[PDB]
Amino acid sequence: MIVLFVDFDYFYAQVEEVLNPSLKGKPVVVCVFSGRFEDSGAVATANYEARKFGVKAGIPIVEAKKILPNAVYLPMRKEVYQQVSSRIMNLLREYSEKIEIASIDEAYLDISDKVRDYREAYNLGLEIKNKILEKEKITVTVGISKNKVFAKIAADMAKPNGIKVIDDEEVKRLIRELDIADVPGIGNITAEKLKKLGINKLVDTLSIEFDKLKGMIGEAKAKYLISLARDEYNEPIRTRVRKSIGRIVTMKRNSRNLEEIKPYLFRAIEESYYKLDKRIPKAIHVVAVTEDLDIVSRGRTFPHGISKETAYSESVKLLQKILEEDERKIRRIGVRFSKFI
DNA sequence: GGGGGAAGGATTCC
DNA sequence: ATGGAATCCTTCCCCC
Ligand SMILES: [Ca+2]
Ligand SMILES: [Ca+2]
Ligand SMILES: [Ca+2]
Ligand SMILES: [Ca+2]
């Protein structure tokens, strides 16, 4: 088996540049504002110009500005970035029929019955970096190896505009010498847990009793890491299917006033129901971010589908269970439809 | 002893 | 300090 993984370089910022080529060479930060105060909000992504000074995804806009006051701060235009991605995904389906669109800027190609050896692989890699650069004027990074995970690690190593092949013998030196926090699925919480278990490199999972491992990181992560380390991971490329839609908005100010919140809550629903297309969810969740950035949500499943009018009614109820049950002020409120028929 | 769901929270990734 | 979505984990639930 051979996986070719494609990762679109500094994606949103790169789109804003493509759409205004004057931006190239300049620090570019794609911002998501919140309209509480003037520069309230957070950073979505930024180019490598900006990123080289610590301006990354997730920091507040405010921080970013202290660091690079004269950078180009642009507001997020997701609709736009979505149409552009789509076109590249269509283009991608013209190389393998076996394709997993994993995110707005990521995809996996199964190219086993379409190439022999990593030399051919590598070449088809170049054909795609190219075709995209020509068609949609976008740089990407490509990773090639035997499974999705090592395909994706390969890409992570070559970013940006890179390409990298991990062969089977290097996969082995990796398992020995790769930091576990660098494995996909291992956020900061899981990395630290493993540290305490004295698990630093992929190989360390073999030296520990499965039950203790399972006890610390759950059964799924457990078997995931273990199979990865045994050179036995081989999960299949398949058409991902969208299982929930939803909106979340930030309120001008934190509050516990039902009548103050509702106008944000219904706007979330309006946007949500627009985003639904013609899909009918059986389920609805009302999602609150309390003042301390904790998250809490009540939901409900129907035996039928949920009309806009009905969803209004239930969301108001579910909002109340929150305010009743939880005792915090609420900073953000949104909705999420799922269980579509 | 176990299969489903369903709900609430956890964690991750882009 | 945003906003979107997936996955997995525990408990609870009903019932066989
Ligand atoms: Ca990317
Ligand atoms: Ca990581
Ligand atoms: Ca909590
Ligand atoms: Ca990425």
Side-chain angles (χ1 to χ4, degrees), chain A residues 5 7 103 105-106 152 156 159:
Chain A
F5 163 79
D7 174 273
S103 87
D105 71 7
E106 290 185 323
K152 185 188 192 308
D156 277 336
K159 287 178 177 165

Side-chain angles (χ1 to χ4, degrees), chain A residues 7-10 105:
Chain A
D7 174 273
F8 306 169
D9 298 322
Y10 62 103
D105 71 7

Side-chain angles (χ1 to χ4, degrees), chain A residues 55-73:
Chain A
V55 181
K56 50 174 185 169
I59 75 166
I61 307 183
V62 151
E63 292 321 291
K65 291 202 181 186
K66 305 164 199 178
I67 306 189
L68 297 180
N70 314 117
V72 180
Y73 295 88

Side-chain angles (χ1 to χ4, degrees), chain A residues 64 135 276 302 336:
Chain A
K135 282 283 176 79
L276 260 175
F302 294 78
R336 307 275 313 179

